Amino acid sequence: ASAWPEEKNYHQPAILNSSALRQIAEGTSISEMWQNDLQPLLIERYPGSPGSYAARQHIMQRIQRLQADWVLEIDTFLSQTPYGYRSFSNIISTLNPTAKRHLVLACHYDSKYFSHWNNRVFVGATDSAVPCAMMLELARALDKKLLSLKPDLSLQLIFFDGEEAFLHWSPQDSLYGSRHLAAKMASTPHPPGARGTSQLHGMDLLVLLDLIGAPNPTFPNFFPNSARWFERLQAIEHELHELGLLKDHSLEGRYFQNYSYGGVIQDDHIPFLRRGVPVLHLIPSPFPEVWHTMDDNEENLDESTIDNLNKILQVFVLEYLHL
Amino acid sequence: ASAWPEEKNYHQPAILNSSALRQIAEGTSISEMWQNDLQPLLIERYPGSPGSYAARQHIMQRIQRLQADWVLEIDTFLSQTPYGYRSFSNIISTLNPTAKRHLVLACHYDSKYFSHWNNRVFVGATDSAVPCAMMLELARALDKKLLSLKPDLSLQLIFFDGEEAFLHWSPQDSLYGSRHLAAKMASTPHPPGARGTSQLHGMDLLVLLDLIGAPNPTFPNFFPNSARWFERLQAIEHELHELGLLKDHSLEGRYFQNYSYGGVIQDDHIPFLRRGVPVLHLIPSPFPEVWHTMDDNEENLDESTIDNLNKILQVFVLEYLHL
Amino acid sequence: ASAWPEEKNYHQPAILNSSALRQIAEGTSISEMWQNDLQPLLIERYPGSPGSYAARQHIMQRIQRLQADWVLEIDTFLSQTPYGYRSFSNIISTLNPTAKRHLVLACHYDSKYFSHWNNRVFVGATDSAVPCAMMLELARALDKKLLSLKPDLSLQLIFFDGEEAFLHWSPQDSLYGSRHLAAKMASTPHPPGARGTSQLHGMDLLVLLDLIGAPNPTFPNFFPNSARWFERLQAIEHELHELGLLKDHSLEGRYFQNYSYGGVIQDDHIPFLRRGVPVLHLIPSPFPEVWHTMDDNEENLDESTIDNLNKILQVFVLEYLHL
Amino acid sequence: ASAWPEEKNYHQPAILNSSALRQIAEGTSISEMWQNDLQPLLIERYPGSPGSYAARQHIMQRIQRLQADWVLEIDTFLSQTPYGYRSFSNIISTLNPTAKRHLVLACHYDSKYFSHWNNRVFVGATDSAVPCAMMLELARALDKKLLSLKPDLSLQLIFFDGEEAFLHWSPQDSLYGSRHLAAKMASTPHPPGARGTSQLHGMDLLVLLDLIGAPNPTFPNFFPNSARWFERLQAIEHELHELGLLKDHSLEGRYFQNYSYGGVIQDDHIPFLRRGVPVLHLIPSPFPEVWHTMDDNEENLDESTIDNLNKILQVFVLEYLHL
Amino acid sequence: ASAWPEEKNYHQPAILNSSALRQIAEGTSISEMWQNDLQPLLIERYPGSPGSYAARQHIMQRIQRLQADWVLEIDTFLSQTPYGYRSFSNIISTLNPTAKRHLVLACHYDSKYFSHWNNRVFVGATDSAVPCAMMLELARALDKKLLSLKPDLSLQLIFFDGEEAFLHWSPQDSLYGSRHLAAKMASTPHPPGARGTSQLHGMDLLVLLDLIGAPNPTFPNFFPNSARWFERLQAIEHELHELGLLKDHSLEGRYFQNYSYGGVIQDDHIPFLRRGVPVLHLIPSPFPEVWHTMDDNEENLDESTIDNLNKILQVFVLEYLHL
Amino acid sequence: ASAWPEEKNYHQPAILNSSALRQIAEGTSISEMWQNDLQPLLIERYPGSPGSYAARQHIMQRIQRLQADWVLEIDTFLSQTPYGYRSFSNIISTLNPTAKRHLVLACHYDSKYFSHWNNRVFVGATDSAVPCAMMLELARALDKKLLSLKPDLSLQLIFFDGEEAFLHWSPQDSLYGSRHLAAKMASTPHPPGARGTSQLHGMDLLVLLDLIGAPNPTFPNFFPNSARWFERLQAIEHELHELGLLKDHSLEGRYFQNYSYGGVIQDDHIPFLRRGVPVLHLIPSPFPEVWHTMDDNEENLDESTIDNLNKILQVFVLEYLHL
């Protein structure tokens, strides 16, 4: 053990001037994310399925064309389900694997298992194809600046498999891929040759995106040790609207209202939270109206709400890394 | 498993025109329940006592008289208590036992054990005698409609024994009939012959009443995955207000105030929720003034409030079931 | 509790003069069991298969034909397997169901699941078809005596489903019917009406047969608190030797060699022993040569050895029960 | 068992009148607490450390100077931790240990471990040095009236050690002293000689103080089985204001506000609540802004808020003990 | 932590010359142990009973007349049983409580709960009134030498309450008093002010006596880390017979045969063994023939076998302490 | 699943003839093992220590020099312990990692921690430095024949770290490296791409070596599901004797004796056995006399016994792999 694992407790942003912001809002394109990153993911992709194989190649192919030095890992594993043993694969994308600290962004890339009702197919556009597509567009839009990284801190993406339950949500029939990965990281020394610190120690903060893409969302501030970065979010939303860099957005319908909760949700942050990781959980209260219906689909997304959030997220990340 | 367990997530009411609502308002009577269903329950009936056996006979012989083909089971079992071993009996009443799905209403029929204090005896008017009687009046007013049932969905009622702690509320000393019954349904194939599904799968939704009977209640919405049905309950209160069918009512004091909660309450629903069954928990917050005191008696109930909620619950059930 | 649960510790045989022993030696026949009770069981009968259902019908219709008032129950339930959910059925046969105490004989009626290897199919002649048939011949030879029963003690038989592991022997994948049934009796009052005692209390002693059918077995004494009854079994072998009633026998190769063991074997008795019930475990050590191989077939059984042990077990039971 | 464990259910306060209230409000001194109880506790005081030992001395000394006949016990124990095995010591201070019923005030007296960041030290002013000094000041201010104790009910204080986690919060890295002490009282008979009642049964109400000192706190009503006593704190606050005995205080921003909370906090009360003890939990929501930073120091505390809260707590305690 | 807790691993006896032995064999009187120490203990003494109270006073009164500086403690506690919560009391007798290391001798002083069959009463003469009486006679016979203790080592006796089960032997209905005391000692620092070592560390070896008093007993050598002192036992038995200091004792019926086991027994050593304490378990294989019968009584003890063992035990203890 | 996990059930050896046996018996050298594999491992080598690191280097180096194409992996992980958190490293050495089936030889390469007593150091000669050198010598002696591997079945070696307990043996203070590695293989799919089979499924037989080196060992047959392979070791021993290829060896005192054992030993095999892997456990009963003392050193080892056992093990391994 040493002292660097407490650095995250004292870390401060580098906020951007109003000329800089302008640039960022101009650096991202909702319509190319729609075409190149999202539409290929709107397919039946439950664990084990052919579409699961397909979504996984798409993701790596998109990261591989970028210019920054990304390092991809495929973490494959076996577990028991209500239908038997099945195989699962998490996807992990890391700049600077050697660095001690990383900021982490994540979502889940599987879609719930369903029968073909009404000759229809479930594809989970908010749940969570869009958040996947948001993580990809961000890495494209900031690619040039991200090269800069050749504070011992950098960035990592995680796309989890097996979040949804197969049959009945339970402590054993849900969260396959994140219950797996959190335990593996708690048992891996980090950095190499370390005697007392694991890879979980290295996670500054986990920002988890889920159920995004519907008009008029409202996000709670969930956690006391993440409260100060939720506030940074509120402020970024505000200066942007004050310069009219957002569309179809009123200050009385803000996304980031400072209002609490208490009654937590089960999601891929629970394995890591139970082990002490600070979490910023970007999920709305309440859930889109189509949650887990065949109508959670492409024609029910609001182009504008998605577009506004890409801008807020991209700013936060740059601010956190001092880029 | 199979495909039918899904249907409950696609399920939608068949809502009532306002004419219908009129018929049903006048089709139940508060004065007949009060004396034929409730007064027989206002007695000492902790598990094992002679009140327990009497209460049990009364419940079953009221159900057995109606025209609909109700099928009764008694589920008797033994558990360890802080006073040593004792005997417990749950009550289950089912229409179309063989149908694959059932909407379920339920409450607890025991009363908590106290010593006689100043020659007063604890009867639990609110906790939960009124929920029992409300359930019994329901099966009467709708007997004619329910009879039709001969979408493979039907109705079921549960009266749990042993909700209350014998000495100190704890995991080991509370919720005796519910913990037992939830593990029993978990292990029982359903429907007969099945090879991969259980009776708990067949539970479309669980409505639990508890601590109903005092005036001015406020009912939080507790759980997201049941929230569409909590909304319905709000519609029903509203309109019936407009149609002048409630009494001593003020939209100031509406029972269903959408606001979110938690939560966070320990009750008979726990062992079922744990295993993946949707729940609709109708217990007020705050509790009544007289909770677990000797004044929880008959003279402290507001006749107008129960009359009102019998109307709301009766409608919900036809609407959920399409009659 | 009460006082009757003690009686089993004070209980003593009523031993048989040698005349009696003669009558009983000639009162059973090995050739009638072999063809009327055994051959119908030599088939593939892993849980869920069609063999399982057939085996089950055969067992019940053999019992149902005899003069003694046997009462049959089928105990059907659902469990999680490494192949997903499946259906299981235990068989229980009881004389004087209401008597407070019962001596219990038992074995497992399923066969282990294998793939067809060189067009051979696994039938488990020793494991445990012969124990089933031995149990069935018993209830025949003594039908006349058992009839007398109308000391509140009587007899019961159990045939467990699901003893064998589906894929890899482990706590979660083995002993499915026994784990389920032991928890069920643990929770059921006995006798009816009781307030402090259970069906497991009523279990005077549990005799489990398994892996019987090859020649030269050796039966360790496993448990102290059943050792007085293991001794009785040694008397019975000895004398019957002296009286020239066994066959192809050598006191060199006596089956019951007093020496101590452990132990240490996982089998259907575990969930019952765990909760305080005396056990008499008649499984050989070492196992047969052909254990879990395809040669565990009919042609490898020694007719003389089973004839011998049917004699020993039949006597024990009259002696334990006083007929 | 006996009947006395029911008394706490029916117990009622003896409300003070207006002449009394001004007496109490003038009887406490904020500057004496500040300089003589509080400043000595603003030191590094994590478990095992010299500051831990100084603090313990300080709390013991100050109680020893008082007239009332407090019985002091140090409850020292041993426990595994993420840094290996360690010794902890709870502080217990009892009037009339023989009395069967006690009202309990509690807090935690350790401070969280941190490395020194840029020459700063964590001293946990709100967390929970202020709560410690409020308990010492109330003992001084009420001393003469406490003498009256010699309704068999007295008062008791607990300073817990090891509340905080060494590395990352979990069930086995936190609440060291309160897990230990709860489980011991549960296994200790009270009053002496009893055969079926424990010391936990004699806890009338556990009032835990935590995270106190910042301006504008708001306290939720956490628990339905203490709600009537929360109500008493609101009435107390309101009448003290109306008499003009509070400083810098607005009825629009009051401390005890009748709003509930769904999703609770882990704290020293869990182990006693899990075993059925009634809790009044005096921790605010939201947490102070300075929570778990080096800025939770002396200069960020609000004098007037703490003096107001002292006066309310003192009144509450006298009315409980009919003094 | 330090180094003295490993001393027990290197500790060697001080063996006695053949003049010394003679003395010891002359120093003990079976007939006064029979009259003064044993006969008062042959009474109904189940937990809670009047005879439990009586046996407990007898024991302390006997220790209090001796001349060495014994320190008595009564450890009273509460636990749940099949019949409810009951109170229990262990008895502890210690020379030199401050010393770091102690040799420990123990047995249980409760007798099993039974109905009065045949107007008869169970008193457990082997189980374990005799071993109690043996521990007392030893302290009398060596009293003078024991004073010598005013290596930091000395001696301690423990008489456990609640060994037997009330209703059905189980992990929760057996071993009350030793499951309790072992956990308490693991959590107590020893010696005072210690940071890393508990009272369990201080136990060199626990010698546990149970079921003694019947002719022709045979004791296994159970444990590899106690094997070397079991051998000392064998040797003491041998030299004594070679000098004819024993009665009715043949070298072909020795008590201490070097022969193994493996299949452990459940008894009061399990709580301490599971936590690493070295155990020498003086229980025979097999159990007396009267085990748990009304015939386990005074007229079935063999005066001579008991007398021989007092001599072997007394020698071992003196040899271990170098006295 | 697939069918191959059944192969190990039907697999049969290819017995060597007499010309072959003399070749093997002459092909191994005890003096080369002694000076080049064994003496370097007689050092303090507890986890975390410099000797731990030297040992690891030594084992890796020696395998690296050999022709066959061993694939080496260091499996380093992190784990809580009685002295805090720590880093451990297992050593794994595989031929043909792709093959689906492997035969596994194993031992532990750490030494127990002790303080120095009178200038002596614990080096664990039998426990388990000798077993480590036997595994290195067999690799040398069979190298040329192992080349033949390129029936899809190869060979694998495991040196476990952290077998021993730091303070006192328990489920959470022992078997650090083998708990870790079992659970990982169970969650890893094999062969690559599989959807329902793990690496554990490919363990044909795990042969664990422990506590080897003393004169006159006797090994029990511990496990019925490996008994046919134990039988092969007896036949091997017997024919090697008859050919006069063993040294100082009597058929009256032979190593593999057909006697069973009831009550097993906790060792590195438990975690694989608990998940259904077949085990041949080569540990003797009784344990060596020098067990866990400073006398388990070089001078107390028996050369001829170890050379005999090498020859038997080498034969056994070739016959498994039809080499």
Ligand SMILES: COc1ccc(S(=O)(=O)NCCc2cnc[nH]2)cc1
């Ligand atoms: C009762 O069964 C449950 C159902 C839902 C929850 S839950 O807490 O609301 N889980 C939501 C997480 C999620 C779903 N799709 C994407 N993310 C929890 C339990």
Ligand SMILES: COc1ccc(S(=O)(=O)NCCc2cnc[nH]2)cc1
């Ligand atoms: C401290 O022990 C506890 C006591 C109460 C709760 S509780 O959450 O408030 N549940 C009470 C449910 C109930 C009582 N009577 C009818 N329904 C929780 C814990």
Ligand SMILES: COc1ccc(S(=O)(=O)NCCc2cnc[nH]2)cc1
């Ligand atoms: C490694 O997995 C294990 C396999 C077997 C045992 S076992 O103890 O040998 N039990 C087998 C019982 C049985 C098998 N067929 C009929 N009865 C124990 C563990």
Ligand SMILES: COc1ccc(S(=O)(=O)NCCc2cnc[nH]2)cc1
């Ligand atoms: C099956 O129920 C059981 C019965 C006995 C055992 S046991 O292992 O044999 N316990 C013996 C301990 C004892 C009894 N009286 C004095 N000491 C274990 C379990």
Ligand SMILES: COc1ccc(S(=O)(=O)NCCc2cnc[nH]2)cc1
């Ligand atoms: C407390 O003392 C104990 C004695 C024996 C056992 S044990 O069960 O026999 N297993 C330890 C085996 C071993 C030790 N070193 C190498 N192998 C465990 C604990």
Ligand SMILES: [Zn+2]
């Ligand atoms: Zn979802």
Ligand SMILES: [Zn+2]
């Ligand atoms: Zn209640």
Ligand SMILES: [Zn+2]
């Ligand atoms: Zn089998």
Ligand SMILES: [Zn+2]
């Ligand atoms: Zn804190």
Ligand SMILES: [Zn+2]
């Ligand atoms: Zn006993």
Ligand SMILES: [Zn+2]
């Ligand atoms: Zn060892």
